[PDB]
Amino acid sequence: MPSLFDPIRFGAFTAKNRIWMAPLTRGRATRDHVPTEIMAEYYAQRASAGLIISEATGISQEGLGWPYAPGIWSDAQVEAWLPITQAVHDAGGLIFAQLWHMGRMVALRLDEIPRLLDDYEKAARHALKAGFDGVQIHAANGYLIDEFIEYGGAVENRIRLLKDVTERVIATIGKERTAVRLSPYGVFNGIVQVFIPAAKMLSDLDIAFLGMREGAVDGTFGKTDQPKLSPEIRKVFKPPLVLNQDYTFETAQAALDSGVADAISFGRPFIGNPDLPRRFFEKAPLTKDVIETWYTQTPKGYTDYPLL
Numbered sequence: 001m002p003s004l005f006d007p008i009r010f011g012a013f014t015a016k017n018r019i020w021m022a023p024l025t026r027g028r029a030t031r032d033h034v035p036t037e038i039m040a041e042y043y044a045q046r047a048s049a050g051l052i053i054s055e056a057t058g059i060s061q062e063g064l065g066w067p068y069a070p071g072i073w074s075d076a077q078v079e080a081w082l083p084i085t086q087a088v089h090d091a092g093g094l095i096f097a098q099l100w101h102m103g104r105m106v107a108l109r110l111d112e113i114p115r116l117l118d119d120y121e122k123a124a125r126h127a128l129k130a131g132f133d134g135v136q137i138h139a140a141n142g143y144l145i146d147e148f149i150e151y152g153g154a155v156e157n158r159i160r161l162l163k164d165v166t167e168r169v170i171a172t173i174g175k176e177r178t179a180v181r182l183s184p185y186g187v188f189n190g191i192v193q194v195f196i197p198a199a200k201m202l203s204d205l206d207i208a209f210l211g212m213r214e215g216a217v218d219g220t221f222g223k224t225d226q227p228k229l230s231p232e233i234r235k236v237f238k239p240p241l242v243l244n245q246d247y248t249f250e251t252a253q254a255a256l257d258s259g260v261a262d263a264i265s266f267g268r269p270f271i272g273n274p275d276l277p278r279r280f281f282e283k284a285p286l287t288k289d290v291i292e293t294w295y296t297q298t299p300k301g302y303t304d305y306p307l308l
């Protein structure tokens, strides 16, 4: 039923459309992970997105340590984020902070889980102080789900750390500000058994929305057929479901038309097309992104892509 251009209620909010910006690590923060003024201009240029999900933002001092990627553990970081959220809000948009913790697959000790929960609580509270609208927790096979550490065996235990993290964040900022991204096919580029229960569990926690990264495409040469995870996620997950990966305008609208997705997030297209929604609306050609400058440290290939 809905158009990509229709508003959408989620959490405490109404996004102005269902063309959202996916989280994108860009490396324009300082070496010691402090946000910079240039990031404010970049996010504001893209505030026509119904919701911006920030770049991965570290929750603990040592455990990032991608330099030039931001964190949110410190007061200096909270202060440096304020210009960015303020610029998005001055442009009428919305912005969630993606909180990042690096996990290992089958490293973290049982005795560090309480510190981890505390780090997430604190990052979520700092995100509010920084003026973000909410936060997105990222989970994937290495990461809160089947993380290398009672956290094994029954599905319940395999998703336990994710549940505990999500409950702590909700206790801190409210379920209406708390979202999750599931990446069942991996993070950077068995499943059914665990991601469908992860999604039912999150639904029962009544989080604001779920992001799921799953190839738009059905039919790939040399690949044997497996059914999509998304229609199964849609059955157990009641709040809004936002799909991601390789969507075009046409396949995005098709997903809304089918009922499986309420909104779609676009990553790479927002790198070179800050006004993606308007290009889609006008059927304008897209500007090609320059892969070379995805993770460099300057405005070039960052804030110098023109608006229509």
Ligand SMILES: Cc1cc2nc3c(=O)[nH]c(=O)nc-3n(C[C@H](O)[C@H](O)[C@H](O)COP(=O)(O)O)c2cc1C
Binding pocket: 022, 023, 024, 025, 026, 054, 055, 056, 098, 138, 181, 213, 244, 245, 246, 247, 265, 266, 267, 268, 269, 294
């Ligand atoms: C430069 C770049 C940075 C990305 N950074 C993140 C990130 O910080 N967090 C995350 O969960 N995914 C990240 N991704 C994955 C994207 O959010 C998205 O899932 C992927 O690019 C597929 O969607 P798209 O085809 O619309 O680009 C990144 C992708 C790229 C290309």
Ligand SMILES: [Cl-]
Binding pocket: 007, 008, 009, 010
């Ligand atoms: Cl709605």
Ligand SMILES: [Cl-]
Binding pocket: 035, 036, 037, 038
């Ligand atoms: Cl700066």
Ligand SMILES: [Cl-]
Binding pocket: 057, 058, 059, 060, 061, 062, 063, 064, 100, 101, 102
């Ligand atoms: Cl971290």
Ligand SMILES: [Cl-]
Binding pocket: 073, 074, 075, 076
């Ligand atoms: Cl501090």
Ligand SMILES: [Cl-]
Binding pocket: 173, 174, 175, 176, 177
């Ligand atoms: Cl709430």
Ligand SMILES: [Cl-]
Binding pocket: 268, 269, 289
């Ligand atoms: Cl692209």
